[PDB]
A paper describes a structure:
The final resolution of the cryo-EM reconstruction was estimated by the FSC 0.143 cutoff to be 2.44 Å for the [name]-O18-POA2 complex and 2.52 Å for the [name]-AWH-POA2 complex. The interaction of [name]-2 with [name]-AWH is homologous to that observed in the [name]-O18-POA2 complex and creates a buried surface area of 896.2 Å2 on viral surface, mediating 55% and 45% contacts by antibody VH and VL, respectively. [name]-2 makes a total of 9 hydrogen bonds and 3 salt bridges contacts with [name]-AWH VP2 while only one hydrogen bond and one salt bridge contact with VP3, showing a biased interaction distribution on two adjacent protomers. On one protomer, residues in VP2 βB (AWH-VP2H65 and AWH-VP2D68), B-C loop (AWH-VP2T71 and AWH-VP2D72), αB (AWH-VP2K137), and H-I loop (AWH-VP2S195) interact with residues in the five CDRs of [name]-2, ordinal HCDR3 (VHK105), LCDR2 (VLY51), LCDR1 (VLY33 and VLT31), LCDR3 (VLN95) and HCDR2 (VHD56). Meanwhile, residues in the VP3 B-C loop (AWH-VP3D69 and AWH-VP3E70) from another protomer interact with residues in FR3 (VLR55 and VLS54) and FR2 (VLY50) from antibody light chain. Consistently, the VP2 68 (D) residue is also positioned within the central region of the virus-antibody interface. The side chains of AWH-VP2H65 and AWH-VP2D68 form hydrogen bond contacts with the VHK105 side chain. Additionally, the AWH-VP2D68 side chain also forms hydrogen bond contacts with the VLY51 side chain. Furthermore, mutations at positions 65 and 68 on VP2 significantly reduced antibody neutralization. In particular, the mutations AWH-VP2D68A and O18-VP2D68A enabled complete escape of antibody-mediated neutralization (VN titer > 250 μg/ml). The conservation of the residue appears more than 99% in available [name] serotypes O and A sequences. These findings demonstrate the conserved antigenic structure surrounding the three-fold axis in both [name] serotypes O and A, with VP2 68 (D) serving as a crucial antigenic determinant.
Author numbering:
A (entry chain 1): 1 to 136, 152 to 209
B (entry chain 2): 11 to 218
C (entry chain L): 1 to 109
D (entry chain H): 1 to 123
E (entry chain 3): 1 to 220
F (entry chain 4): 15 to 39, 64 to 84
Write the structure that this text describes.
């Protein structure tokens, strides 16, 4: 207690300052690798889709945790529900290559297709925000090289992506639900029907 | 009193008598410089590791909480550093930022000086979490200077500063300036910014 | 209304004249950030004094400002033939209210 | 030369709506603040509205709150002042001003002034 | 000659949190180096503990200002992570994605006033069990509280203890409840000398033993 | 690792299952910040 505020050095007091005892902490569920290793849904999906992790909903679990980091690295695992033949290409591939079966191509089995894809970007890490343009001037557009490749099929219905080996580097603001004109955000919590 | 600190970059010196320390950003040192993307042709220019000055804004009593003034750190530099930017294709460097807001101990309020990588225009709600970035506060009761040191970081090991600005110096009002009869009417905010560990690669042809 | 400014003043050529700007009730201080403008007829206003002490580089050194007697003061030393115009005093009071003076029609004799 | 040019004025009936444009040249329009000041013939200046560099904070005079709306487009280097429910007392010469100079970076500068757009409201 | 296998019926299928890994499709790929990349954080609560974020009082201000009135309660808020006062904090931002929490929450009070302004403040933890938080420091002095003065050190940190019946508390608040299951945190201004128009900036960060568990995905 | 059980070793080689990492020339910044946080009281205690 009673430090210099302006120095911005971390100060973490505990309950022993007034007679309490600090308890055991188990922080497995806030680990980055654990929290990011889930299937999040890419809702806007077309027959030819370029896999960009910024397509995730900004208020979803994985989406918001990703947007809370400036830079990220992860291997990618996809689940695709397609009605034709699914072809995947790496980052630098021309769009015309999606029509050729010598590329990684999965044939429709029945429920859906689950594949593991490597990180193919030519960059050290990928960024959720880029302050500039890679074209030879608004910065709202991420460089075209921030993607995990592209997939093409006759029709894609659902696309789930899972971040493996996730690594997040520079934290960014993460917002909860806006609360106005009330003391707490009151929402229905699951309670037994009785 | 440990409150006197002298920073000396190159042949330039900046001394403050109301220091609250140095915040070392996201790392206490630089990462590896001789990467495989330059084929060993990078070289270090020590003549550009000097202090240069810039005016940020006039902190007045009308500015409420959330007023942000930004400064993308690779800026219009009229010295050796700008010459390097115009003469080499690829460049990397950290920053050593000192922000001065000199009033007197009878003024109130508080400024938040933060270095934001890959800056994007923050919404009103996001300004409440601006302390997630390397930062210090400036309060006239305590200090007149905030000193932040950050490394080079980005998607690429070397950047083209005419296409991308990794860093941005964000100064935000946390508490409005308070002026009594004996305090300063307003506070002008200035910067002493020094590039650190400047490396260049790729010699460009002469501009005619 | 709120800000009191002399309707007009007369100064001889090459002389010195001081203009007075203040409130009906209260004292003008640095917190109000006084500003002075010059507006010849048929011309957009030109900034002369900001912060009651500073002068834009283009503005001649003749025009000077200060705070004296709890009122904003504009001083012109060695008036020329080009100083005959309407001088306005600008005062800050809350973010939603910016007050302008009545306007002194200075006449150079 | 840092200059501001404004247009869009004219003669309209009371209760009408119109938009005043404000095109700036010679400076980065996104790095400066815009103030709108109107001057009735034979009257003094009157500050109307104020917008920041990124529209974070917007302020209107107590007498023109609600009726007037101010906006800016940094990409087009143009500032807009939308006026609705115009009254008979709104007839004045409207100025679009840029706040800021070399040694002054705040809303109290009021450095660059446009020629002025004439807006006349009458029955 | 083939091993017989019983293909169980309920097993298989896709679970979005399933701990299996998919079959590889594309061969040996070497990533470009990222050794010693600055900034890395491997646990969200490390960031929450290291970097406090501001609360929200009044008309959306991160500070409480000295009141001219005789009222001495600067601010009171529900201890819930879903409270209006915490709604713009990193701690709440990450706690919205977990069902339950436990541990200590730290409040940081940074005084930002002229050196001629002196004040004494009091922060009190009011457990549940009372219908209304006390509005006076002499009634709140009977609960866990801390008083401090302003001086050279402008920042004071207070730990809100986790005292509850259950081992874990809910991060969300239910509609069918008018009083928070956790108590309140009241901030009082005991006294002040020439401290009008002087502000007390309040921040929040996770404590040493703060814990979040059970990830969820609400609309958020 | 991350969210993985599977006490049995993976059927496929690590070269195909995941992209491999290279190096140049412990590493968590915010763990170090949290560990270096000042605890206890500053002045005298009674």
């Amino acid at each position: 207690t009673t430090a210099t505020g302006e120095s911005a050095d971390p100060v973490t007091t505990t309950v022993e300052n007034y007679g309490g005892e600090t308890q055991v902490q188990r922080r497995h569920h806030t680990d980055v690798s654990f929290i990011m290793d889930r299937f999040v849904q890419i809702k806007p999906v077309s027959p030819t889709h370029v896999i960009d992790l910024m397509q995730t909903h900004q208020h979803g679990l994985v989406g918001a945790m990703l947007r809370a980091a400036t830079y990220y690295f992860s291997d990618l695992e996809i689940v695709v529900n397609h009605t034709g033949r699914l072809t995947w290409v790496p980052n630098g591939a021309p769009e015309a290559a999606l029509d050729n079966t010598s590329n990684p191509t999965a044939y429709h089995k029945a429920p859906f297709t689950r594949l593991a894809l490597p990180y193919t970007a030519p960059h050290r890490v990928l960024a959720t925000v880029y302050n500039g343009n890679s074209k030879y001037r608004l910065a709202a557009q991420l460089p075209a090289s921030f993607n995990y490749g592209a997939i093409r099929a006759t029709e894609i219905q659902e696309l789930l992506v899972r971040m493996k080996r996730a690594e997040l580097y520079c934290p960014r603001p993460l917002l909860a639900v806006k609360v106005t004109s009330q003391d707490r955000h009151k929402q229905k919590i699951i309670a037994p029907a009785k | 009193e440990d409150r006197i600190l002298t920073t000396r970059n190159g042949h330039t010196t900046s001394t403050t008598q109301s220091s609250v320390g140095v915040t070392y950003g996201y790392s206490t040192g630089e990462d590896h410089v001789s990467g495989p993307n330059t084929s060993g042709l990078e070289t270090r220019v020590v003549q550009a590791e000097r202090f240069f000055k810039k005016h940020l804004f006039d902190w007045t009593t009308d500015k409420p909480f959330g007023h942000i003034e930004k400064l993308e750190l690779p800026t219009d530099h009229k010295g050796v550093y700008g010459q390097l930017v115009d003469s080499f294709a690829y460049m990397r460097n950290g920053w050593d930022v000192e922000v001065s807001a000199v009033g007197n101990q009878f003024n109130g309020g508080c400024l938040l000086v933060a270095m934001v990588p890959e800056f994007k225009e923050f919404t009103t709600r996001e300004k409440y979490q601006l302390t997630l970035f390397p930062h210090q506060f400036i309060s006239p009761r305590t200090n007149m200077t905030a000193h932040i040191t950050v490394p080079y970081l980005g998607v690429n090991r070397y950047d083209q500063y005419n296409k991308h600005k990794p860093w941005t110096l964000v100064v935000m009002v946390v508490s409005p300036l308070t002026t009594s009869s004996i305090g300063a009417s307003q506070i002008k905010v200035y910067t002493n910014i020094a590039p650190t560990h400047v490396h260049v690669a790729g010699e460009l042809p002469s501009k005619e | 209304q709120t800000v009191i400014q002399e309707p007009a003043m007369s100064v001889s050529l090459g002389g010195t004249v001081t203009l007075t700007c203040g409130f009906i009730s209260g004292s003008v201080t640095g917190t109000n950030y006084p500003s002075w403008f010059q507006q010849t007829p048929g011309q957009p206003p030109r900034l002369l004094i900001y912060y009651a002490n500073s002068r834009p580089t283009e503005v001649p050194s003749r025009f000077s400002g200060a705070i004296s007697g709890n009122k904003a003061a504009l001083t012109i030393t060695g008036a020329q033939a080009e100083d005959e115009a309407d001088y306005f005093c600008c005062l800050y009071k809350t973010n939603n209210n910016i007050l302008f003076g009545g306007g002194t029609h200075l006449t150079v004799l | 030369e840092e200059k501001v040019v404004e247009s869009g004025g004219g003669l309209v009936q009371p209760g009408g709506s119109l938009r005043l444009s404000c095109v700036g040249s010679g400076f980065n329009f996104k790095n400066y603040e815009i103030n709108w000041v109107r001057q009735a013939p034979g009257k003094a200046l009157e500050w109307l509205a104020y917008i920041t560099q990124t529209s974070d904070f917007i302020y209107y005079a107590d007498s023109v709150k609600g009726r007037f709306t101010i906006s800016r487009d940094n990409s087009r280097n143009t500032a807009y002042l939308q006026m609705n429910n115009l009254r008979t007392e709104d007839t004045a010469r409207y100025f679009c001003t840029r706040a800021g100079l070399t040694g002054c970076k705040s809303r109290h500068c009021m450095y660059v002034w446009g020629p002025g757009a004439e807006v006349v409201v009458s029955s | 000659g083939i091993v017989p296998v019983a293909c169980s019926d309920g097993y298989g299928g896709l679970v979005t949190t399933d701990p299996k890994t998919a079959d590889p499709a594309y061969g040996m790929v070497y990533n470009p180096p990222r050794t010693n990349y600055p900034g890395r954080f491997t646990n969200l609560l490390d960031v929450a503990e290291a970097c406090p974020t501001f609360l929200c009082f009044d008309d959306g201000k991160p500070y409480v200002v000295t009141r001219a009135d005789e009222q001495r309660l600067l601010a009171k808020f529900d201890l819930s992570l879903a409270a209006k006062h915490m709604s713009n904090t990193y701690l709440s931002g990450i706690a919205q994605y977990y069902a339950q929490y436990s541990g200590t929450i730290n409040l940081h009070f940074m005084f930002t006033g002229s050196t001629d302004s002196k004040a004494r403040y009091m922060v009190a933890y009011v457990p549940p069990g009372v219908t209304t938080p006390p509005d006076t420091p002499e009634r709140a002095a009977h609960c866990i509280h801390a008083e401090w003065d302003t001086g050279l050190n402008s920042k004071f940190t207070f730990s809100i203890p986790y005292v509850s019946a259950a081992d874990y508390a809910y991060t969300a608040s239910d509609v069918a409840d008018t009083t928070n299951v956790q108590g309140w945190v009241c901030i009082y201004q005991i006294t002040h000398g020439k401290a009008e128009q002087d502000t007390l900036v309040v921040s929040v960060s996770a404590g040493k033993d703060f814990e979040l568990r059970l990830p969820i995905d609400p609309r958020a | 690792s991350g969210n993985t059980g599977s006490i049995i070793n993976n059927y496929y080689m690590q070269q195909y299952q995941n992209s491999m990492d290279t190096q140049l020339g412990n590493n968590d910044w915010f763990s170090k910040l949290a560990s270096s946080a000042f605890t206890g009281l500053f002045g005298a205690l009674l």
